[PDB]
Amino acid sequence: MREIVHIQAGQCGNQIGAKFWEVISDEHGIDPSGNYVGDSDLQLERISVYYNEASSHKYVPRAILVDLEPGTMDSVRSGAFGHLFRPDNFIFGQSGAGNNWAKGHYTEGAELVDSVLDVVRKECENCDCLQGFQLTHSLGGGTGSGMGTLLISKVREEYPDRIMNTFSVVPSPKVSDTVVEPYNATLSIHQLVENTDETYCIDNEALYDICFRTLKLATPTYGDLNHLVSATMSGVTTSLRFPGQLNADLRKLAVNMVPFPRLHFFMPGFAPLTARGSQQYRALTVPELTQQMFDAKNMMAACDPRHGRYLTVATVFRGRMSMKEVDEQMLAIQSKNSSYFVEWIPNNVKVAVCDIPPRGLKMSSTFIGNSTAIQELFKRISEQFTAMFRRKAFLHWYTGEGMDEMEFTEAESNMNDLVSEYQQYQ
Amino acid sequence: MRECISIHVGQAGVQIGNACWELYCLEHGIQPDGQMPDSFNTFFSETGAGKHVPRAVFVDLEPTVIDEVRTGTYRQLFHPEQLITGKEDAANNYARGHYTIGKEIIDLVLDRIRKLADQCTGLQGFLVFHSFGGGTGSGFTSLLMERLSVDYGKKSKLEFSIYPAPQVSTAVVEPYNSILTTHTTLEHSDCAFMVDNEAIYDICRRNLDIERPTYTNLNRLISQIVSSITASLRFDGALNVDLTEFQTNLVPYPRIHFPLATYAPVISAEKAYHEQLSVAEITNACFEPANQMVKCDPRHGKYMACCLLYRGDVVPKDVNAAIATIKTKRSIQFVDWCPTGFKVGINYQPPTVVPGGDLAKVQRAVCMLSNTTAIAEAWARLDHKFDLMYAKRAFVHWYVGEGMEEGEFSEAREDMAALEKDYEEVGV
Ligand SMILES: Nc1nc2c(ncn2[C@@H]2O[C@H](COP(=O)(O)CP(=O)(O)OP(=O)(O)O)[C@@H](O)[C@H]2O)c(=O)[nH]1
Numbered sequence: 021m022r023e024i025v026h027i028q029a030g031q032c033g034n035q036i037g038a039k040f041w042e043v044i045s046d047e048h049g050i051d052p053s054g055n056y057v058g059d060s061d062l063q064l065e066r067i068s069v070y071y072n073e074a075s076s077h078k079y080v081p082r083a084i085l086v087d088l089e090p091g092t093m094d095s096v097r098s099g100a101f102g103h104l105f106r107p108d109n110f111i112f113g114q115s116g117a118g119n120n121w122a123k124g125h126y127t128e129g130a131e132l133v134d135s136v137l138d139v140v141r142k143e144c145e146n147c148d149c150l151q152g153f154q155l156t157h158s159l160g161g162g163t164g165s166g167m168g169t170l171l172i173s174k175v176r177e178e179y180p181d182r183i184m185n186t187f188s189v190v191p192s193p194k195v196s197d198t199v200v201e202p203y204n205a206t207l208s209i210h211q212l213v214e215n216t217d218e219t220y221c222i223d224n225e226a227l228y229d230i231c232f233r234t235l236k237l238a239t240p241t242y243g244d245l246n247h248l249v250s251a252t253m254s255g256v257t258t259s260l261r262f263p264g265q266l267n268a269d270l271r272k273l274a275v276n277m278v279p280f281p282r283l284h285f286f287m288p289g290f291a292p293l294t295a296r297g298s299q300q301y302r303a304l305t306v307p308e309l310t311q312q313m314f315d316a317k318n319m320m321a322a323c324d325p326r327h328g329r330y331l332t333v334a335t336v337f338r339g340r341m342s343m344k345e346v347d348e349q350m351l352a353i354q355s356k357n358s359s360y361f362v363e364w365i366p367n368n369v370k371v372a373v374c375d376i377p378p379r380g381l382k383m384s385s386t387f388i389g390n391s392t393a394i395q396e397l398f399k400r401i402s403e404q405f406t407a408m409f410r411r412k413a414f415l416h417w418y419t420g421e422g423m424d425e426m427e428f429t430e431a432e433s434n435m436n437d438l439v440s441e442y443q444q445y446q
Numbered sequence: 447m448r449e450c451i452s453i454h455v456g457q458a459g460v461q462i463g464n465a466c467w468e469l470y471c472l473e474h475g476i477q478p479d480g481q482m483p484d485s486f487n488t489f490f491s492e493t494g495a496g497k498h499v500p501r502a503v504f505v506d507l508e509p510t511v512i513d514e515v516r517t518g519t520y521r522q523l524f525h526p527e528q529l530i531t532g533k534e535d536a537a538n539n540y541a542r543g544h545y546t547i548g549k550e551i552i553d554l555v556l557d558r559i560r561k562l563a564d565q566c567t568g569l570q571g572f573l574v575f576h577s578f579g580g581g582t583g584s585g586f587t588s589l590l591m592e593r594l595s596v597d598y599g600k601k602s603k604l605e606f607s608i609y610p611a612p613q614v615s616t617a618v619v620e621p622y623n624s625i626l627t628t629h630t631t632l633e634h635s636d637c638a639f640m641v642d643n644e645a646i647y648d649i650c651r652r653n654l655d656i657e658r659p660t661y662t663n664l665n666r667l668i669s670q671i672v673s674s675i676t677a678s679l680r681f682d683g684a685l686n687v688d689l690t691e692f693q694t695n696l697v698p699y700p701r702i703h704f705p706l707a708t709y710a711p712v713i714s715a716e717k718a719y720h721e722q723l724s725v726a727e728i729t730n731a732c733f734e735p736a737n738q739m740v741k742c743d744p745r746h747g748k749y750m751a752c753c754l755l756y757r758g759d760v761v762p763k764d765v766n767a768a769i770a771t772i773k774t775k776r777s778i779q780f781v782d783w784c785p786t787g788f789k790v791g792i793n794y795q796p797p798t799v800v801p802g803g804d805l806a807k808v809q810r811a812v813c814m815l816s817n818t819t820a821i822a823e824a825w826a827r828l829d830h831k832f833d834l835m836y837a838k839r840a841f842v843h844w845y846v847g848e849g850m851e852e853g854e855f856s857e858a859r860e861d862m863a864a865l866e867k868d869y870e871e872v873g874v
Pocket residue numbers: 029030031032033035036116117118119120124158160161162163164189197198223224227242243245246
């Protein structure tokens with residue numbers, strides 16, 4: 021009930037996906053074989069949200085692991101909790117399409133788009149009821165940005181009545197493992213402003229910065245970064261996936277967080293983040309989680325909440341607490357940080373709670389926030405784009421494959437029109 | 447032979463249904479099975495030899511809520527079908543609940559209450575429990591209340607709205623949906639009770655001394671005021687009060703029917719032994735500017751009428767003496783046209799306490815449902831929230847995309863607007 025598909029793209033999504041189910045399988049006591057071993061029944065009641073119930077009381081996810089090269093999925097099959105996936109949902113290609121958006125969007129994506137539109141069209145109508153669509157990609161690559169953007173663009177014109185979402189790892193200047201990621205991200209955002217009604221602009225820059233000061237780990241691998249994002253979006257969906265004292269599903273938070281269609285680019289968060297040593301000293305309580313998740317350093321994105329004011333936020337808890345200590349504080353947050361919150365919209369918060377905790381912890385939250393701080397993000401990409409676009413550099417990889425030059429100036433106009441709206445309300 | 451029944455909308459109403467029916471089953475001695483090892487005739491339906499079942503419907507689009515009941519301890523108590531359950535929630539939207547998703551589910555709930563209505567000899571009215579959050583409690587009740595206005599226009603239509611507080615709002619679009627929901631309740635419902643989440647917090651924080659109150663402790667208090675209103679029917683009393691005369695005393699005008707509520711004795715177990723509860727004390731406790739469960743200033747707003755429903759070991763003289771003390775107090779005033787603002791109700795049933803309940807066992811208790819102009823202040827705060835964001839045209843395209851028109855929002859404000867003037871005019 022209120023089911024939803026799960027899509028990947030590139031190294032990012034497929035690696036995020038591998039740990040997306042490392043935790044959810046633990047939230048339901050699922051083995052890597054797909055077998056149910058968990059003891060609780062609250063977790064099994066809504067197994068149907070993510071899992072097509074297979075024979076021998078087994079469970080396997082929707083999990084459309086799509087990619088333009090087999091290097092990822094050949095790894096995911098060997099990875100832990102990799103056998104539970106369906107092999108039919110391993111939609112591979114010949115060449116990974118490189119970091120070229122157009123060569124991953126127009127032709128080489130079209131070569132494979134029909135193979136992945138049929139399997140989602142299979143899973144979609146197979147579901148009793150679908151809440152929406154959900155994927156995990158990056159705006160910097162060509163795979164996650166070329167076909168991962170084409171894909172959702174074709175799913176909305178096939179299923180426009182259904183809301184959806186996307187967890188897009190945006191590029192960054194410091195952690196920049198790509199040259200043309202302005203072009204890849206400037207062109208994907210051209211579609212995501214209309215082809216998706218909520219985008220969680222995670223950025224790999226912060227996820228290191230969080231793990232140095234807060235976790236204080238000496239070897240943050242990509243997995244350790246993903247363990248934040250995997251346990252993050254699990255919080256976004258825990259409302260509908262488990263019972264709750266107060267529930268906020270993907271639609272109930274999207275509708276009341278997005279005032280205008282263009283303004284739906286978010287930043288997530290996750291309150292309890294501690295070293296293995298400094299956890300015992302910190303008594304985790306709702307007033308302390310709350311101040312920990314509204315600050316600048318906990319939220320995972322390449323922007324500063326201090327500069328830009330909040331429009332809307334939400335706090336999806338995963339603990340058995342009292343709603344008094346929750347909302348008395350989140351009014352106190354808006355009293356202390358009244359300048360940082362917008363005055364037009366009173367009580368920008370949309371709180372939500374779940375009765376069950378995650379494994380190991382007693383309490384947890386997630387901070388989704390639509391701010392004007394991400395103005396600086398898109399304002400920065402337009403600077404990287406404009407400097408690289410003034411001199412028509414790297415275009416012949418785009419222009420030769422397709423991608424007429426007029427479309428580049430259209431993309432920056434929208435993003436310049438996008439930030440133009442954030443400053444309009446700021 | 448009175449047959450008062452109770453429909454429930456939203457997790458606000460459903461989780462109150464868990465409290466209200468946990469309470470009633472403790473009153474009559476009904477086990478959680480539904481089989482008791484007359485009073486129950488009002489709320490329950492006898493079946494077989496000893497099996498009793500509640501006359502209610504827990505309609506809720508979000509299946510995650512009702513599954514707590516269908517996976518709970520009252521599984522074998524509630525009739526399986528009257529736990530109506532949709533498939534996709536209204537998601538804090540009048541539009542998604544009022545028209546779009548409502549059409550898919552009215553056929554199940556209407557035909558079930560109709561199976562309860564005709565089964566009842568003669569019913570007084572149905573108790574609604576809908577919050578103004580925006581989901582089922584705002585739109586799905588709007589269509590439900592009007593379809594019952596045409597089906598049952600004569601019968602009383604009560605409700606208990608968890609009105610969003612002005613200082614605190616659990617969601618973002620509560621300033622919208624509460625203003626949209628005002629139309630159906632002022633035109634259909636005969637008297638619409640109001641409750642705040644921030645108000646109940648202050649009671650249980652200050653008096654009961656609980657700094658971590660949960661919704662299983664809030665609703666456990668609204669379960670009592672509802673039981674207080676219905677104990678006149680559900681049990682005998684030396685001076686009973688029926689719903690048709692209850693609302694007759696609060697409602698001098700047809701539109702002025704939005705009272706607040708109050709429940710004086712709210713004290714811990716150890717707190718009980720130290721302080722003896724007298725009829726003149728619980729009476730005076732109700733008239734405090736904070737003991738009521740609506741965030742307002744009763745000192746500024748003149749009272750229009752009241753129905754004090756004492757219950758338990760109570761006598762009438764000290765009620766008649768207590769109310770004499772109230773009229774002498776200068777902080778408590780009444781409008782000129784109303785010489786008498788006190789209706790009274792007594793019954794020999796004390797309030798029943800849930801085991802492991804924050805509430806204490808008291809030999810007597812009182813609930814009063816005051817209709818006054820103090821509620822205009824709470825509404826003036828949220829009407830300022832509405833026109834503020836609505837001036838910016840915020841979140842309207844989520845409604846317009848669902849089917850409603852932009853003109854409807856101004857009309858709903860106009861209905862609330864003229865409603866504010868009514869409390870001001872009668873105050874003169
Ligand atoms: N925070 C994380 N960031 C990641 C992870 N994996 C990749 N990335 C980042 O995401 C960006 C996306 O790169 P891709 O996944 O598209 C590599 P791929 O060859 O599949 O893309 P194409 O260039 O389209 O072929 C890249 O700049 C990385 O810095 C991860 O596990 N965590």
